[PDB]
Amino acid sequence: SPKEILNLTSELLQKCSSPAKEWEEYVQIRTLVEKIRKKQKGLSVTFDGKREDYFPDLMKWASENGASVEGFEMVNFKEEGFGLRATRDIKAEELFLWVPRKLLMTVESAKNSVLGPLYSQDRILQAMGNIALAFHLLCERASPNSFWQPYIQTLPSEYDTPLYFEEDEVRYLQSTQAIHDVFSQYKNTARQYAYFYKVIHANKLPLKDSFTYEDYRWAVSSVMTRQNQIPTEDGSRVTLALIPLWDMCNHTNGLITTGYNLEDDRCECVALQDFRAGEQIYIFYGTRSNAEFVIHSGFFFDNNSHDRVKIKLGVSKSDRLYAMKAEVLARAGIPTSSVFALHFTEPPISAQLLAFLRVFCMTEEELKEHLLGDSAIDRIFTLGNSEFPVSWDNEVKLWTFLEDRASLLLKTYKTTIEEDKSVLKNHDLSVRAKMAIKLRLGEKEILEKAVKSAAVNREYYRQQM
Ligand SMILES: C[S@@+](CC[C@H](N)C(=O)[O-])C[C@H]1O[C@@H](n2cnc3c(N)ncnc32)[C@H](O)[C@@H]1O
Ligand SMILES: [As]
Ligand SMILES: [As]
């Protein structure tokens, strides 16, 4: 049994160290992982009660270490799972939550823990603070007298990140942009488990006794769905942390502000609106897309204002004007090839993508004028500015290119928008399956809206004198 585990581990490391069809490669590492997982005992450490039985002990511990515990409670919400609910009215500008640095789990708490000796010797742990935090969480989970036990015992036992999807759930993402990041996440997590199973030279860790794949998947998913950035002890730069109490807050586009109080050395949340008793207390996780939310947080946000789909574009080395185009882009601080995004909102493109498309479609004479800088206007500075077109001709060409490109990308999809919406009527679809389908539907709705915006712009510029 232990010799067999290490044998399958070595094969997993090799299988995940070769680059790449993508789906075929994914099912291979998936059948390999599900085999190693079958031979293991799930999570090495489990707790006697359900997570909700442990919330009073999390509150007591946070309270004893100086955190704000009054005016809220933990409630199981239908749409977001567990979260915080106000027990009284909260007024705008009220400093509602504060969590002292002592409660946090950081790379700094990791280095000072039983994990320090292995952290000091391992190069992978040194370059990836999130993986180091994942291991710090694992080591402490398995230490019964750990200071962080009231926090670890209230953490979820599973997540809705793609690492937890069944093959049939991921299948729904075939022929989408998002599926590429899902494969990469699966291939990197498996590679990481393999490397670290072999490495696990500090044997004083409770991971020497038991370190399953389910342990690693739980640790990295706990970190990616909950990690927040905090400043360092001196305030020089940003670092990652797991913040107890605070990380019970779900996401909404709400009237709250979060920050770090350097002087009092604590994580702070200020209400920017009055909240009524019995209302859920949320925080803003950031202007993340639904792809970033599904893949790194395990949820799809329906009311996402910031939804977008990734798009790769580059100037062709076979274009006669490649060198001039590349130079104008470099002077504007834009690469010759990169991953851009198409936004659901009007305008679908950023100042950086507008700048790129204008250069991509410039004539030789326009390129020369930009490189000479003999305009009364700094044309490099206004390159991504909608108010300063290079020419109506350039605008017509770039909006034509975008319309055509988005139309082409749309055809690469296996299902229609109506088919996605019909599928979504199945009340028995799993949470994970609904997330994959909404994501697939979302990509198409963004591309369809981008075709329409590009046509409106093409028409507008073809109407100019
Ligand atoms: C930082 S924790 C928030 C507390 C989490 N609900 C729990 O029970 O521990 C983040 C997790 O909450 C969920 N979540 C947060 N906001 C959400 C939302 N608006 N809709 C659905 N799920 C949400 C996802 O499972 C996410 O991975
Ligand atoms: As904070
Ligand atoms: As708050």
Swiss-Prot record:
Changing residue 228 to A/V: Decreased binding to actin and decreased protein-histidine N-methyltransferase activity. Increased protein-lysine methyltransferase activity toward an actin mutant with a Lys instead of a His target residue. GO terms for cellular component: chromatin; cytoplasm; nucleoplasm. Changing residue 228 to F: Shows protein-lysine methyltransferase activity toward an actin mutant with a Lys instead of a His target residue. It is an enzyme of class 2 (transferase). Changing residue 191 to A: Decreased binding to actin and decreased protein-histidine N-methyltransferase activity. Keywords: Actin-binding, Cytoplasm, Methyltransferase, Nucleus, Phosphoprotein, S-adenosyl-L-methionine, Transferase, Ubl conjugation. The chain holds residues 21 to 493 of 594 of the full protein. S-adenosyl-L-methionine binds at residues 51, 80-82, 226, 247-251, 297-299. The SET domain specifically recognizes and binds actin, suggesting that it does not accommodate substrates diverging from actin. Residues 70-286 form the SET domain. Its EC number is 2.1.1.85. It is found in: Cytoplasm; Nucleus. Signal peptide: none annotated. It catalyses: L-histidyl-[protein] + S-adenosyl-L-methionine = N(tele)-methyl-L-histidyl-[protein] + S-adenosyl-L-homocysteine + H(+). GO terms for biological process: actin modification; peptidyl-histidine methylation; positive regulation of DNA-templated transcription; positive regulation of muscle cell differentiation; positive regulation of transcription by RNA polymerase II; regulation of uterine smooth muscle contraction. Its main location: cytoplasm. Shows protein-methionine methyltransferase activity in vitro on an actin mutant with a Met instead of a His residue at position 73. This is Actin-histidine N-methyltransferase. Phosphorylated by GSK3B, which is required for recognition by the SCF(FBXW7) complex and subsequent degradation. Ubiquitinated by the SCF(FBXW7) complex following phosphorylation by GSK3B, leading to its degradation by the proteasome. It comes from the Eukaryota. Interacts with MYOD1. GO terms for molecular function: actin binding; histone H3K36 methyltransferase activity; histone H3K4 methyltransferase activity; protein-L-histidine N-tele-methyltransferase activity; RNA polymerase II-specific DNA-binding transcription factor binding; transcription coactivator activity. Protein-histidine N-methyltransferase that specifically mediates 3-methylhistidine (tele-methylhistidine) methylation of actin at 'His-73'. Histidine methylation of actin is required for smooth muscle contraction of the laboring uterus during delivery. Does not have protein-lysine N-methyltransferase activity and probably only catalyzes histidine methylation of actin. Coiled coil: none annotated.
